[PDB]
Structure formats: structure tokens, C-alpha cells
Amino acid sequence: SKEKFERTKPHVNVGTIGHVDHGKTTLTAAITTVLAKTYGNTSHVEYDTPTRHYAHVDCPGHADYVKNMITGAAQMDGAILVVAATDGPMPQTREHILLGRQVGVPYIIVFLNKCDMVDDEELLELVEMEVRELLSQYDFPGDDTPIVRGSALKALEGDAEWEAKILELAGFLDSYIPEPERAIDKPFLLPIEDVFSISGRGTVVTGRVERGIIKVGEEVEIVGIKETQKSTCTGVEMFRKLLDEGRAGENVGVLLRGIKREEIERGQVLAKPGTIKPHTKFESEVYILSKDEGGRHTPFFKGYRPQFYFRTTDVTGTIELPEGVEMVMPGDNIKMVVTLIHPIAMDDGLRFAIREGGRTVGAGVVAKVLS
RNA sequence: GCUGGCAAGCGAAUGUAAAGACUGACUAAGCAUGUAGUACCGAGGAUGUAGGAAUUUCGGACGCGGGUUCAACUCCCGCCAGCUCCACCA
Numbered sequence: 274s275k276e277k278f279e280r281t282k283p284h285v286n287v288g289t290i291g292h293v294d295h296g297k298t299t300l301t302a303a304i305t306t307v308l309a310k311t312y313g314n315t316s317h318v319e320y321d322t323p324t325r326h327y328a329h330v331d332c333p334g335h336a337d338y339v340k341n342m343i344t345g346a347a348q349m350d351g352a353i354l355v356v357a358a359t360d361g362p363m364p365q366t367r368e369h370i371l372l373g374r375q376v377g378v379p380y381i382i383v384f385l386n387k388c389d390m391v392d393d394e395e396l397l398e399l400v401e402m403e404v405r406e407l408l409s410q411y412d413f414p415g416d417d418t419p420i421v422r423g424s425a426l427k428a429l430e431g432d433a434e435w436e437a438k439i440l441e442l443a444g445f446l447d448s449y450i451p452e453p454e455r456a457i458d459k460p461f462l463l464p465i466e467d468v469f470s471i472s473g474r475g476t477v478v479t480g481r482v483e484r485g486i487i488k489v490g491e492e493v494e495i496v497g498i499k500e501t502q503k504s505t506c507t508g509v510e511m512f513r514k515l516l517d518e519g520r521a522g523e524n525v526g527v528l529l530r531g532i533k534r535e536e537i538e539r540g541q542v543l544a545k546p547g548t549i550k551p552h553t554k555f556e557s558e559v560y561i562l563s564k565d566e567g568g569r570h571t572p573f574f575k576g577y578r579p580q581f582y583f584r585t586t587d588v589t590g591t592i593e594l595p596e597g598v599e600m601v602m603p604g605d606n607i608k609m610v611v612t613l614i615h616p617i618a619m620d621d622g623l624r625f626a627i628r629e630g631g632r633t634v635g636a637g638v639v640a641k642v643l644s
Numbered sequence: 645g646c647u648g649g650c651a652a653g654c655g656a657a658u659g660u661a662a663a664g665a666c667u668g669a670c671u672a673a674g675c676a677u678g679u680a681g682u683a684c685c686g687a688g689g690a691u692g693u694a695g696g697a698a699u700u701u702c703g704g705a706c707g708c709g710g711g712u713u714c715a716a717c718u719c720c721c722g723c724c725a726g727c728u729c730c731a732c733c734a
């Protein structure tokens with residue numbers, strides 16, 4: 274809160290969701306150190322590339338942390354698959370790539386650690402070919418993707434070769450990730466993802482601005498679980514730096530006045546007044562396929578109670594279908610009505626995720642609202 | 645049925661009552677194929693192998709949902725209702 278941030282080199286979000294205990298934290302720390310040297314839980318570090326300013330999100334690679342990882346990847350603009358070159362693909366890596374494809378991460382860069390732990394020039398190529406084949410078979414891009422090999426912990430050790438290699442890694446990261454599209458057309462909207470309580474400052478809510486801008490001193494409305502209320506913003510900041518306005522697409526922390534830590538939970542949205550209204554039941558078309566798209570095999574019936582993940586959080590919901598469909602067997606391209614317990618401010622065209630038993634069943638697009 | 649040959653009175657003895665074949669227009673009365681009928685049932689005949697009565701039970705409900713030992717009413721998971729532990733300072 275002592276640095277006046279300059280809105281140059283537009284913000285781009287990059288997230289590392291690589292394999293567990295394969296060097297994600299070490300890799301991001303090494304990247305930050307080498308960039309700050311040559312240029313002068315979800316860990317949100319930042320670094321200013323000469324091309325663009327990036328915010329690096331090291332997400333937890335644990336399966337049980339998938340719920341917050343969903344927002345971390347939806348938050349994310351470019352994925353970094355961090356994997357060891359001595360073990361190759363893993364079930365955890367496959368789950369992570371499936372989640373990334375289901376959340377819609379366009380650009381992914383593969384990094385191969387433990388390059389020097391292997392005294393050969395064929396095993397590294399074999400594992401690179403294997404991961405490339407995995408990407409090409411799991412609906413991912415192919416030979417037009419920069420694949421990065423090298424050591425993630427020696428990048429911090431005194432060297433020159435690996436420093437140059439990681440600098441080249443950062444270069445094509447910023448090359449392969451062009452200027453992203455921002456949605457500052459509609460009024461301001463920001464889904465909440467974390468809450469902090471600053472002693473002497475107050476409560477601050479973190480998140481990626483979905484749309485619109487936030488000027489210092491603007492009135493906004495909290496809409497979400499069990500509550501729709503009003504508030505005032507004072508002191509827009511980003512990564513402990515002074516800001517003047519907050520564009521859309523970057524993870525920022527907005528300071529709210531008259532906010533209670535227990536009263537405000539994750540799942541709500543800070544919108545412009547009179548824009549969106551929370552609803553508990555709405556009509557949506559489902560896009561489940563027969564068997565090979567996450568959906569189950571046996572022809573289940575009504576009363577299904579899945580979690581409907583949204584931009585922020587999820588909630589257990591019920592589904593009702595119009596007459597003409599005796600069963601709700603997988604293969605549901607039809608429209609139905611979904612009722613949720615916790616009301617969340619929603620708009621037409623919203624894309625949500627249907628999940629159950631730790632696996633995604635199908636997608637859904639909001640068609641109408643029944644309040 | 646009027647008549648039909650005549651006895652019987654015109655108010656007397658007092659009546660055999662078969663009704664199928666054959667020609668053809670057939671789409672019964674333009675118009676597709678005909679000599680007995682493929683229709684229509686309703687108290688005329690039959691199904692009784694399967695669905696209705698009893699009779700063994702499958703179905704359910706211990707929070708729901710389902711991929712689970714079927715013996716599930718906690719044999720595998722995601723939630724939600726409480727207890728605890730921390731991560732958690734734009």
C-alpha cells in the first residue's frame with residue numbers, strides 16, 4: 274500500500290497446477306528470482322516481464338483442493354504443467370489437465386523438471402513425446418506449443434546456463450500468451466474468492482474483476498448467499514500497491530467499508546447497484562453426452578443432487594425436467610429447471626459446471642431465471 | 645294379394661305361404677374385381693398362455709444422490725447439519 278502501480282504492460286494471469294511434490298513452488302520462486310535479477314494454498318506472486326506484467330498463481334495440486342483450484346484455473350489465463358521428466362505422466366497430472374480443459378484454459382505450457390537428474394539424451398525425449406501424445410489425445414494443442422525442459426531448483430543455484438534457459442522460458446511464455454481480451458463494457462462486477470481483515474484498514478475482498486471498472490470512492494452492492502446489501506469502496510489496491518482504477522481480468526483486492534468477516538463469505542459478487550438480482554431457481558439446457566464425457570453410465574432418474582459450480586463457488590441443487598422425458602439417462606441435451614438453496618446473482622448465458630462424486634457429469638448454460 | 649275352371653254362401657266345407665339357383669351393372673343409385681355374405685354383435689361360442697381378486701414376495705426408509713458388499717440401514721465418494729484444529733493481513 275506504498276507503491277503507486279502503473280497500468281503498463283497489461284496484466285496477464287499465469288497459473289502453475291503441475292504435479293504434486295514435483296517442484297511447482299520451487300519453479301515459480303526461481304522464475305520470480307531470475308526475472309527480478311535480470312530485470313531489476315494459492316500463492317499469488319507477481320513479476321513484470323518486458324513484454325507484459327504477469328501474476329503467477331501456484332495452485333495446490335492436491336485432489337482434495339480441487340474446489341478452490343477450479344476458481345484458481347478460471348482465474349488463470351495461462352497454465353503451466355509442472356512435471357518431473359523421470360516419472361512422466363501421472364494420474365494427478367491427467368486429472369489436472371482434465372480439470373483445466375473442463376474450466377476452459379486455452380494456453381498451456383509443459384515444463385520438465387529433473388533434466389540433470391537423468392544422464393541420458395533419450396529418456397527426456399521419450400517423456401516429452403509421451404506428454405505431447407497425451408495432450409494431443411486429450412483435446413489439447415500439439416506441435417505449436419513451447420515445451421520447456423530444465424531444472425527447477427538449480428535455477429536458484431549459482432549458474433548461467435539454467436538462468437538463460439529459464440529466461441528463454443519466460444520469453445516464450447509471454448510470446449505464446451498474447452494480449453488477452455478484457456470485458457470492460459458492462460457495469461462493474463467482481464466475484465469474491467478470499468477475505469482478509471486489515472487491522473486499522475478494514476475488510477478487503479479479493480478476486481478477478483469479471484467486468485467493468487472500479488474507481489476509488491464508488492458505491493457497489495454485495496449480492497450473494499442469503500444477503501443483498503450495499504457498501505462503499507475506499508482504496509482500490511492490487512498486490513499491496515496503490516491503484517486508481519481497477520480494470521477487468523486481473524486479480525485485485527477491493528477494500529469494503531462496513532464489512533463483517535463472518536457476515537461476508539466466499540461466493541458473493543460486488544456489482545454495480547441495480548444490475549443483477551440473486552435467484553434460487555432457473556432454467557438451463559444441459560450438454561451431457563452418452564458415456565465418454567464425464568457423465569455416468571447407468572440411466573439414473575429424477576431427484577439427482579449434484580454440485581453446481583459457478584464462477585466463485587458451488588452448491589447442491591435439484592433438477593426437474595418437463596414432460597416427455599421419463600428418464601434422465603446420460604445423453605441429456607434437453608433443457609430443465611435447476612433449483613439451488615443458496616441464491617447467487619446470475620445472468621443469462623452463464624456457464625456452470627455439474628459435478629458429483631468428485632467427477633464432472635456435464636455442462637449447463639443458463640437460459641432463463643425463475644427467482 | 646286382385647284374377648284364374650267351377651261346384652259353396654257372398655258372410656260358406658274353409659286354404660298348400662317354397663323362396664333357393666340363375667343372366668348381368670358390382671365398387672348396393674358414375675366409378676376397382678360378386679351369387680351368398682369378408683360385415684355387426686352382446687349374451688351366441690371359444691382365449692384362460694396374463695393381467696386384475698387372494699397367494700410367495702421384487703418395489704420402500706434412518707440425509708439425500710448415485711459408480712459400491714446386495715446382506716446397506718454408515719461395503720466406496722461429493723455435499724450438507726454440529727465439534728475441533730489451523731492455513732487466512734490488498
Ligand SMILES: C/C=C\C=C\[C@@H]1O[C@](O)([C@H](CC)C(=O)NC/C=C\C=C(/C)[C@@H](OC)[C@@H](C)[C@@H]2O[C@H](/C=C/C=C/C=C(\C)C(=O)c3c(O)cc[nH]c3=O)[C@H](O)[C@@H]2O)[C@H](O)[C@H](O)C1(C)C
Pocket residue numbers: 343347371372374375376377411412560564565566567568582583584624625626627633634635636637
Ligand atoms: C470443472 C468444473 C468447473 C468449471 C467451471 C465452469 O466451467 C464451465 O461452466 C464449463 C462450460 C464449458 C463446464 O461446465 N465445464 C465442466 C463440465 C463439463 C465438461 C466439459 C466442458 C466437456 O464438454 C462436455 C469438455 C471436457 C469437452 O470435451 C471435449 C473432449 C473430450 C475430452 C476428454 C475427456 C473426457 C471428458 C472423458 O470423459 C475421458 C475420455 O473420453 C477418455 C479418457 N478419459 C476421460 O476422462 C472437449 O475437450 C471439451 O472441452 C465454464 O468453463 C465456466 O467458465 C466455468 C469455469 C465457471
Ligand SMILES: Nc1nc2c(ncn2[C@@H]2O[C@H](COP(=O)(O)OP(=O)(O)O)[C@@H](O)[C@H]2O)c(=O)[nH]1
Pocket residue numbers: 291292293294295296297298299300334386387388389390423424425426427
Ligand atoms: N533433483 C531435482 N529436484 C527437483 C527439481 N525440481 C524440483 N525438485 C524437487 O522438488 C521439491 C520442491 O517441491 P514443491 O514445489 O514444494 O512441491 P509442489 O508444490 O507440490 O510441486 C524440492 O525439494 C526439489 O528437491 C529438479 O529439476 N531436480
